[PDB]
Ligand binder design. Structure first.
Ligand SMILES: [Mg+2]
Lengths: 329, 77, 76
């Protein structure tokens, strides 16, 4: 028979370097090494170097996890997808070698694809709409024309950064997100923030500046912090609702560092009841960058016959998700 | 203009082969040079030959490649 | 082990002078040696000769010196 087909995934687009291992029915292994810049904001050259030194130990601790023999790995999927050049080349290289070292095939995966497919996998969704909310990414994507199509998006700032550049203007350690999350709790009143949805696209610069101007005005912070969430998540809840009843589907998935917000999850599962369609809240841990979500998106590619000899492979920091054919829904 | 030349020896001649290959794909991959590099394989030893305008340019290029080779090396190991 | 050899030429022989001096004071300040460095002054050209155990170790060294040198030049 055809033995349970096993893959190993390498994620390394931004700051997270992770390696996963799965097969059709299993999730044999997976751990990451996040580059933690106490500073804050993008730090490309520093990131690659982080990786470069721990990529060694991730892919190797993993094998131990899966407790599978090294011979047992069949495919090798890395994240050639969108991201930071220094990091992508580090991952790309590392893979191009492991493929040789272990003597098996290899394919380049697209990054956000992995977020969909791993989330889709983890929940059992057949053809959902996706809410990509990571660093500088505010994406709402869906499988429509035999490929994953991006419908709406932020025209200025990824929701995640607007969040952090307020914390880093309201004097707060770069653990910005959650610090403002468990801060909007004690928010008493709702101030006014520029609500900008237009089609399925959004803008966030407006929110920020109007929020900073309120800040120096000497307003509350719990109030500002509270208002910004309800105002921006309001903007996503609308766009979502729309994305659904445009490409006509009955399911949702949240992927990203932003997607770990306790109140955002609520405002979504709530829209679920009112839309009449399932709000699969993916495993609270698979929301950040992981190597294994790569393995999952590769598995699917190879299984549908898509293959690529080593030479063809090369990073692409500008990798459109609708550039890859996804013929399996 | 600056001038650079790096050489690192590997235990065996085949390890050299592997690392060369791995990184060679990356060499070719790059669109924009911030300097001119010459890639070569020797015995069990890879050779780098760089020509940059200033010292800030050359530096970044080195960092790249040296990071790539440490990637290949460590995987093999 | 890795072997390294760099050379940058300057406009005049005195710019080399000044610079080498700026870096040489730093060379001598250095407490640690993740690799061995040989510092030399030529015509209008400074010369480096590094010997590292590994490539990562070699890398960080070059960043130090090459980052010291751009420091000098730029003030000048
Ligand atoms: Mg991501």
């Amino acid at each position: 028979a055809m033995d349970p087909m096993i893959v190993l995934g390498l994620e390394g687009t931004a700051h997270t370097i992770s390696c996963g291992i799965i097969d059709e029915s299993r999730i044999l292994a997976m751990e990451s090494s996040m580059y933690r810049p106490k500073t804050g904001g993008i730090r490309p050259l520093d990131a690659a170097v982080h990786h470069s030194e721990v990529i060694d130990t991730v892919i190797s601790r993993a094998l131990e996890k899966a407790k599978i023999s090294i011979h047992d790995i069949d495919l090798i999927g890395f994240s050639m997808g969108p991201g930071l050049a220094p990091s992508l080349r580090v991952t790309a290289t590392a893979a191009r070698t492991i493929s040789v070292l272990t003597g098996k095939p290899i394919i380049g995966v697209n990054h956000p694809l992995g977020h969909i497919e791993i989330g889709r996998r983890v929940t059992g969704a057949i053809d959902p709409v996706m809410l990509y909310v990571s660093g500088g990414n505010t994406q709402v994507i869906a499988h429509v024309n035999g490929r994953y199509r991006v419908l709406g998006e932020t025209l200025d700032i990824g929701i995640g950064n607007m969040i952090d550049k307020f914390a880093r203007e309201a004097g707060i350690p770069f653990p910005g997100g959650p610090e403002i999350e468990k801060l909007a709790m004690k928010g008493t009143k709702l101030l006014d923030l520029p609500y900008s949805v237009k089609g399925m696209d959004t803008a966030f610069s407006g929110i920020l500046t109007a929020a900073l101007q309120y800040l120096k005005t000497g307003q509350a912070i719990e109030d500002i912090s509270y208002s910004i969430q309800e105002t921006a998540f309001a903007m996503l809840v609308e766009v979502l609702e729309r994305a659904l009843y445009v490409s006509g589907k009955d399911e949702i998935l949240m992927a990203g560092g932003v997607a770990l917000n306790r109140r955002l999850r609520d405002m979504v599962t709530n829209m679920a009841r009112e839309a009449g369609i399932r709000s699969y809240l993916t495993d609270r841990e698979y929301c950040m960058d992981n190597g294994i979500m790569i393995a999952q998106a590769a598995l699917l590619m190879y299984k549908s016959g898509v293959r690529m000899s080593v030479e063809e492979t090369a990073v692409n920091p500008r990798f459109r998700i609708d550039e890859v054919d996804a013929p399996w829904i | 203009r600056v001038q650079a030349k790096i050489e690192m020896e590997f235990p065996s001649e085949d390890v050299a082969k592997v690392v060369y290959e791995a990184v060679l794909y990356e060499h070719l991959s790059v669109p924009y040079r911030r300097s001119e590099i010459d890639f070569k394989l020797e015995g069990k030893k890879i050779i780098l030959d760089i020509k940059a305008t200033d010292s800030s340019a050359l530096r970044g290029t080195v960092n790249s490649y040296l990071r790539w080779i440490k990637a290949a090396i460590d995987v093999i190991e």
